[PDB]
Amino acid sequence: SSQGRFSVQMFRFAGNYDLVYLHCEVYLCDTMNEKCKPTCSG
Amino acid sequence: RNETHATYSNTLYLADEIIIRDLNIKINFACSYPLDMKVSLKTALQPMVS
Amino acid sequence: KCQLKSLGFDKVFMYLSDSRCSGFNDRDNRDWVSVVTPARDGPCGTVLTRNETHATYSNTLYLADEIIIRDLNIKINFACSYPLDMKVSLKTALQPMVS
């Protein structure tokens, strides 16, 4: 859809580091011109 | 849209009257957008561990 | 290295106040993992606190088995000091000749 969400347990950067930031890079897609749902397995 | 960008294309029409008789005016305009973007929360996060 | 292996940390992560001081491995009588930093103020972020008698070098080491930590943070608060007074002597005997 037009919204993407995910959840994860909290961690900490091992080291002399006390703050954590998040940076995502997005790629829009055509709902019809190509297949957008990605599926992966081990 | 090509692989990198998607553009929206339309043409504008200029006339001083309902009917045109000379010097037809066509404004071929289009602006685009890339398909990739970079985002970063403006909220600082601070973990607490034993 | 064997002890920490038994402790359940497959690969340990060695970090001072600065991450550029990543530790390494060395063998003298067994498998050791070790870190080396100079004895100065801050090359690897080492604090120098000098009183009238001694000067100590204080830095803290960080242990983890992963780049991220989720439980049981480890802080090796280490510091070794040096005195400021000492006694030295030549090791060559002197033998003066006079009239």
Ligand SMILES: *[C@@H]1O[C@H](CO)[C@@H](O[C@@H]2O[C@H](CO)[C@@H](O[C@@H]3O[C@H](CO)[C@@H](O)[C@H](O[C@H]4O[C@H](CO)[C@@H](O)[C@H](O)[C@@H]4O)[C@@H]3O)[C@H](O)[C@H]2NC(C)=O)[C@H](O)[C@H]1NC(C)=O
């Ligand atoms: C997919 O499509 C996109 C969208 O069209 C396309 O990006 C476009 O690339 C072309 C080819 O370089 C650009 O065409 C323009 O042509 C003239 C020069 O020939 C100039 O107007 C442009 O250069 C300007 O670039 C900057 C724009 O402000 C400024 O420094 C200055 O004005 C320069 O003159 C440019 O070359 C067209 O503008 C871009 N569109 C953009 C950048 O939004 C992309 O190449 C295509 N990808 C493919 C086919 O793989």
Ligand SMILES: *[C@@H]1O[C@H](CO)[C@@H](O[C@@H]2O[C@H](CO)[C@@H](O[C@@H]3O[C@H](CO)[C@@H](O)[C@H](O[C@H]4O[C@H](CO)[C@@H](O)[C@H](O)[C@@H]4O)[C@@H]3O)[C@H](O)[C@H]2NC(C)=O)[C@H](O)[C@H]1NC(C)=O
């Ligand atoms: C100036 O700074 C110097 C450097 O720190 C400081 O000397 C330190 O004195 C303190 C206070 O006595 C020592 O603290 C240690 O504390 C515990 C006991 O509470 C023990 O670890 C130490 O005693 C050990 O001493 C021998 C060391 O091998 C052994 O007999 C045995 O392990 C004992 O337990 C000691 O008391 C600290 O170790 C010294 N550091 C030295 C001597 O390098 C000095 O006091 C400061 N001067 C001031 C504040 O005027």
